[PDB]
């Protein structure tokens, strides 16, 4: 039913951040001046993770549309969806393999086989669907119609794997330069025919909500995912710390614990802003999901920043650029959430059900609730005008503290009306 | 007004499974003769994982009971729930610290402090709720009542942290020999109030009720996805062919150095199939469950535990460790794992037990429309696992592969394998 999408999107959420693990798992230890090559590696892994989320979310969106055109499902449909998931989950690893092995044919060959498989599987789940129009087709407009939808939906589903088969036969047998014929497989679902039926309708609100909640949950506890399996003090530590006194050898994990606490607090607060926004969103538009994807990507990036902030690498005097990085990451991951909300200029009639319209009941409330994080990150970014850059700690402390008394911070403006 | 609970349990799922990472991350290679030490370490880690899942699941049950005794949600309530989720997230690491340091009082102290944390924030949640009846009360039952429901729910929420307070002070009182008050914390809200003593005096329900079907459904989906992709986490993060490999494999030819991950590649390719099939059985079952009783969730917890255990089994099967002639018993253990993880599902099913009036809405009753279909779809896995367990009757133990391939294959033709019995009626 609609429940089968819950698992098949929680799985996609947890597969959309599988490539974030090597970002945090790599060390930033100053043991060598290799910081040049280490940074060359960190930027590579970041560019691999950001091109993984933005290649899994589009698959998730094609999948969510296809399951929006097959609304009611049964056993065989659940099996075919499971197969489609088994194929989609192979996207991050194979994409990493292709990026790390560019000039070798097998890499992009496997990546294009990986996308061809999910394409043909979805084609199967839509053919089996349209062979049972009474049972599995969504509604009357898709049930009783010209019955010509099959052609258009098969096209919109198979264009991915077909363009891919083209890019694969052209891939590296000759001229491995036109494999941009692959990178154009992402634009067509998002926008190519909009500027160049109507199955291109915006996603369902519940689906993007569940995906965002999944990717917030995983990226919050991503730190505790290793602070638990690494920082067990290893009772052989009796020789370490010159003595026993478990608290002594445990205090070594103090920086990582202060990194976690902050990372989870910030990710949970960003999730709270996202949830207070999506609680009033009536019908998530296309631009809504487009902004949400990037917001989620930078949120997924965030834990690396929070880890780098609470590290004490060498020459830690002119290396205060770490707070600049950990603040620009927050400023991106939250300014995109704020853009999601400010995309209500004239769509407020359709979207944003009338409780937060221009001059609504709690308009300023949610507005400032969402704009609280970009401004708070900007305030810390402004540390370039002073030297006490450690103010980031106290600032994010009061930041987390605000949303409690922030109903009354709004009453402050209410009384400032006069 | 309930998406917050969805996020809370989708986070509690990964927090529950966080302790399964070191089990799979262990070294199964026997390249050094240390089978005894590695086996003891693996047993230790499995025990820690099982205890961790049990404690996090009982904490999650308490949390969902509380958030069922409060229907609506406010911003302050959302922040309090976030603090609760953080404090309860800190449970697995602290429990591992305690189990690896039982004699030192610091571990038990930190664990019962991590209880005195969550517990107290749930007390604060329910206090804030009862200070706003017309706003955050669940239904007219709690809205219009004697208002001693607060006096009862504070008790049922704080009786745990109080026991942990006692355990923590006994930890440093002298010789913490007992230290078992945490077991009493785990055991009381399940059996004690149901059997030992109840409090009353006007009183309808909602002391400790069966969990909401949506909550346990979302938790099961979370953990199932988390394992099915737990194997892919490792295969994706730690098996990049390292372009330095131009010296490795004695040549280039990326397929050469890529075939090295083949064993664990197919291991994941089978583990995902099996875990997804188990989830499909769960989804088919819970689609007809009307009102999941308490024993239903109790059995579902153990089912999820052994499901989370499964990846270790599927890694053990596809291993080619030293002396691979008499060590075939990897298939034995990996089959008992599946057998448990699915027979608990079958037991959740067989908890119909004339409760068809309440549970199992009238489509799967004795003599229902497809009761035989549901029974077979749920019992396909334990029966096939026992068939593979029967490998002890011969030597061709490799039959596990073909039999599990057939297991995946059956539910595609299940609607006709049931028609087989339908025609066999005559
Ligand atoms: K979920
Ligand atoms: K998850
Ligand atoms: K994970």
């Amino acid at each position: 039913s609609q429940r089968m999408l819950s698992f098949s999107d929680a799985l996609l959420s947890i597969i959309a951040t599988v490539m974030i693990l090597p970002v945090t798992h790599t060390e930033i230890s100053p043991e060598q001046q290799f910081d040049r090559s280490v940074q060359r590696l960190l930027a590579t892994r970041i560019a691999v993770y950001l091109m993984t989320f933005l290649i899994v979310t589009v698959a998730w969106a094609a999948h969510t549309r296809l399951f929006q055109v097959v609304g009611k499902t049964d056993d065989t449909l659940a099996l075919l969806n499971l197969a489609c998931m088994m194929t989609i989950t192979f996207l991050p690893y194979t994409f990493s393999l292709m990026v790390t092995f560019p000039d070798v044919p097998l890499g992009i060959f496997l990546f294009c086989v990986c996308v061809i498989a999910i394409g043909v599987v979805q084609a199967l789940i839509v053919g089996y669907a349209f062979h049972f129009p009474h049972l599995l087709s969504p509604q009357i407009q898709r049930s009783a119609h010209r019955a010509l939808y099959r052609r258009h939906v098969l096209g919109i589903v198979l264009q991915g794997p077909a363009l891919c088969f083209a890019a694969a036969i052209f891939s590296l047998f000759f001229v491995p330069l036109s494999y941009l014929l692959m990178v154009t497989v992402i634009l067509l679902p998002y926008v190519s025919k909009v500027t160049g039926f109507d199955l291109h309708e915006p996603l369902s609100k519940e689906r993007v909500e569940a995906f965002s909640d999944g990717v917030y949950a995983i990226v919050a506890t991503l730190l505790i995912l290793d602070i638990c399996e690494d920082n067990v003090p290893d009772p052989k530590d009796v020789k370490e710390r010159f003595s026993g006194s478990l608290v002594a050898a445990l205090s070594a994990t103090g920086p990582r614990f202060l990194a976690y606490f902050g990372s989870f607090a910030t990710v949970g607060l960003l999730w709270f802003a996202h949830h207070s926004l999506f609680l009033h969103v009536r019908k998530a538009t296309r631009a809504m999901g487009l902004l949400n994807t990037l917001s989620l990507a930078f949120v997924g990036g965030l834990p690396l920043a929070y880890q780098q902030t609470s590290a004490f690498a060498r020459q830690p005097r002119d290396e205060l650029e770490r707070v600049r990085v950990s603040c620009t990451i927050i400023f991106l991951a939250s300014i995109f959430q704020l853009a999601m909300w400010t995309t209500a200029l004239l769509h407020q009639a359709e979207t944003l059900q009338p409780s937060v319209w221009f001059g609504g009941r709690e308009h300023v409330l949610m507005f400032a609730k969402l704009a609280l994080y970009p401004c708070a990150s900007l305030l810390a970014f402004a540390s370039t005008c002073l030297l006490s850059r450690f103010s980031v700690g106290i600032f994010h402390l009061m930041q987390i503290a605000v949303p409690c008394a922030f109903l009354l911070l709004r009453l402050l403006v209410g009384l400032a009306l006069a």
Side-chain angles (χ1 to χ4, degrees), chain A residues 6-23:
Chain A
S6 201
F7 163 80
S8 159
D9 91 87
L11 180 138
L12 246 51
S13 153
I14 204 258
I15 198 53
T17 48
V18 64
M19 276 310 303
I20 219 269
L21 262 304
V23 164

